[PDB]
Design an enzyme around this catalytic site. Structure first.
Site, PDB file in Angstrom:
ATOM      1  N   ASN A   8      -8.493  -6.736  17.490  1.00 44.56           N
ATOM      2  CA  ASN A   8      -9.541  -7.441  18.255  1.00 44.56           C
ATOM      3  C   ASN A   8      -9.902  -8.700  17.433  1.00 44.56           C
ATOM      4  OD1 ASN A   8     -11.809  -8.418  19.536  1.00 44.56           O
ATOM      5  ND2 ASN A   8     -13.104  -6.582  19.086  1.00 44.56           N
ATOM      6  N   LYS A  10     -11.839 -11.020  18.109  1.00 45.55           N
ATOM      7  CA  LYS A  10     -13.214 -11.402  18.364  1.00 45.55           C
ATOM      8  C   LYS A  10     -13.195 -12.912  18.587  1.00 45.55           C
ATOM      9  CE  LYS A  10     -14.827  -7.406  15.964  1.00 45.55           C
ATOM     10  NZ  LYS A  10     -16.006  -6.888  15.197  1.00 45.55           N
ATOM     11  N   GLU A  95     -20.424  -5.291  20.403  1.00 38.86           N
ATOM     12  CA  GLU A  95     -20.981  -6.657  20.428  1.00 38.86           C
ATOM     13  C   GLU A  95     -21.440  -7.062  21.838  1.00 38.86           C
ATOM     14  OE1 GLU A  95     -18.320  -7.210  16.566  1.00 38.86           O
ATOM     15  OE2 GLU A  95     -17.738  -8.394  18.285  1.00 38.86           O
ATOM     16  N   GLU A 163     -16.166   3.986  17.881  1.00 35.64           N
ATOM     17  CA  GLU A 163     -16.528   3.069  16.752  1.00 35.64           C
ATOM     18  C   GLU A 163     -17.998   3.280  16.489  1.00 35.64           C
ATOM     19  OE1 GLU A 163     -14.800  -0.567  18.879  1.00 35.64           O
ATOM     20  OE2 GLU A 163     -13.859  -0.681  16.868  1.00 35.64           O
ATOM     21  N   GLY A 169     -17.755  -3.966  11.133  1.00 27.71           N
ATOM     22  CA  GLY A 169     -17.957  -5.211  10.402  1.00 27.71           C
ATOM     23  C   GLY A 169     -18.681  -5.095   9.046  1.00 27.71           C
ATOM     24  N   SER A 209     -14.280  -0.927  10.589  1.00 24.03           N
ATOM     25  CA  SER A 209     -13.852  -1.286   9.203  1.00 24.03           C
ATOM     26  C   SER A 209     -12.619  -0.534   8.781  1.00 24.03           C
ATOM     27  CB  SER A 209     -14.998  -1.120   8.188  1.00 24.03           C
ATOM     28  OG  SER A 209     -16.081  -1.967   8.629  1.00 24.03           O
ATOM     29  N   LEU A 228      -8.824   0.499  16.661  1.00 25.36           N
ATOM     30  CA  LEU A 228      -9.170  -0.834  17.143  1.00 25.36           C
ATOM     31  C   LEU A 228      -9.684  -1.524  15.897  1.00 25.36           C
ATOM     32  CD1 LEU A 228      -9.519  -2.888  19.431  1.00 25.36           C
ATOM     33  CD2 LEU A 228     -11.768  -2.026  19.748  1.00 25.36           C
ATOM     34  N   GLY A 230     -10.966  -4.986  13.768  1.00 25.06           N
ATOM     35  CA  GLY A 230     -11.523  -6.297  13.929  1.00 25.06           C
ATOM     36  C   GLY A 230     -11.167  -7.212  12.754  1.00 25.06           C
ATOM     37  N   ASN A 231     -12.018  -7.235  11.732  1.00 28.02           N
ATOM     38  CA  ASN A 231     -11.862  -8.191  10.624  1.00 28.02           C
ATOM     39  C   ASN A 231     -10.452  -8.161   9.981  1.00 28.02           C
ATOM     40  OD1 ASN A 231     -14.402  -9.170  10.979  1.00 28.02           O
ATOM     41  ND2 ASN A 231     -15.310  -8.122   9.235  1.00 28.02           N
TER      42      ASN A 231
END
Length: 246
Positions: A8, A10, A95, A163, A169, A209, A228, A230-231
Site C-alpha cells: 500500500n 499510500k 486512514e 491491522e 505506521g 508495521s 498488507l 505500508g511504509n
C-alpha cells in the site's frame, strides 16, 4: 490457500521514484500462480504504475466509491475501475476510517459495489489501543467483520486484513502470537457465517508495521496468509517481504 502480499504506497511517489521502485520489484523472480502480489499506487499514478510493473504483479486502487457513476465529484466508481481493468481495491483502511469518517456501512456498500463490478477487495479492520486496553479486541473485530462478511460470494476474491490500529505506521508490530489469536477468531466467524470450506479458502492477512525483519515469523502462523504492507513497501527491500511468502 495461496499467500498474498500487498504494497500500500499510500499518498507517496513521483514519476521518477515509481520508475526506480518498479524496476527493483520487477527483478524479483516469483511465480504469480503460487503467490498473489499486488501493488496499490495513488489513483493518478495507476496508469504509470501498471505500465511499468511486469504482469506477475497485480495492481489495484487504494479506495473506491460507495456510489455508482453519477454526481459524486472526486469519487472513482467500481464501474469505472472495471472498465480500466483495475483488478483490486482496498476498502476499510484505518486512514479512511480515521481522517475521512468512513463507517462500517461505507465499507459494506463499497464491497457490494466492488463485487457487483468484478473487483477483488482487500478489506481492512482492527481495534484501537483503547479498545484493546478495555479488553474489547475480539468484540470489535467481530462487529467490523460482520458488517460485510455476508456479501462475500467467491472466497478467493475477497481478502481480509487484520491491522490493529496501534501497529499501523508506528513500528509497534503485533507479535505472531497476538496476530494469530485474532486471525483464528476471524476465520471462525467466516466458518460460522459462510461454511468451513469457505473459511479454509479465504485469505486473512496481517498488516501493521510489517518489515523485512519480522515478516517470516508472522507468515509462519497457521491463520496468517500474507500481509498488507505500508511504509516498508516504499523501499526496494520490499522484495524480501515478498520472498518470505514464497
Amino acid at each position: 490457500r495461496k499467500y498474498f502480499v500487498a504494497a500500500n504506497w499510500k499518498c507517496n511517489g513521483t514519476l521518477e521514484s515509481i520508475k526506480s521502485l518498479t524496476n527493483s520489484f520487477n527483478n524479483l523472480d516469483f511465480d504469480p500462480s503460487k503467490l498473489d502480489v499486488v501493488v496499490f499506487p495513488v489513483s493518478v499514478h495507476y496508469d504509470h504504475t501498471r505500465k511499468l510493473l511486469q504482469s506477475k504483479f497485480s495492481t489495484g486502487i487504494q479506495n473506491v466509491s460507495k456510489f455508482g457513476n453519477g454526481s459524486y465529484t472526486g469519487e472513482v466508481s467500481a464501474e469505472i475501475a472495471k472498465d480500466l481493468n483495475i483488478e483490486y481495491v482496498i476498502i476499510g483502511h484505518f486512514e479512511r476510517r480515521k481522517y475521512f469518517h468512513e463507517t462500517d456501512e461505507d465499507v459494506r456498500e463499497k464491497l457490494q459495489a466492488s463485487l457487483k463490478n468484478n473487483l477483488k477487495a482487500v478489506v481492512s479492520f482492527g481495534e484501537s489501543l483503547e479498545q484493546r486496553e478495555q479488553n474489547k479486541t475480539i468484540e470489535v473485530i467481530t462487529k467490523q467483520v460482520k458488517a460485510f462478511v455476508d456479501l462475500i460470494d467467491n472466497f478467493d476474491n475477497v481478502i481480509l486484513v487484520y491491522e490493529p490500529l496501534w501497529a499501523i505506521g508506528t513500528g509497534k508490530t503485533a507479535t505472531p502470537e497476538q496476530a494469530q489469536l485474532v486471525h483464528k477468531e476471524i476465520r471462525k466467524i467466516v466458518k460460522d457465517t459462510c461454511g468451513e470450506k469457505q473459511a479454509n479458502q479465504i485469505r486473512i492477512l496481517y498488516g501493521g508495521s510489517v518489515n523485512t525483519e519480522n515478516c517470516s515469523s508472522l507468515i509462519q502462523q497457521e491463520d496468517i496468509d500474507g500481509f498488507l504492507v505500508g511504509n516498508a513497501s516504499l523501499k526496494e527491500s520490499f522484495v524480501d517481504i515478498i520472498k518470505s511468502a514464497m
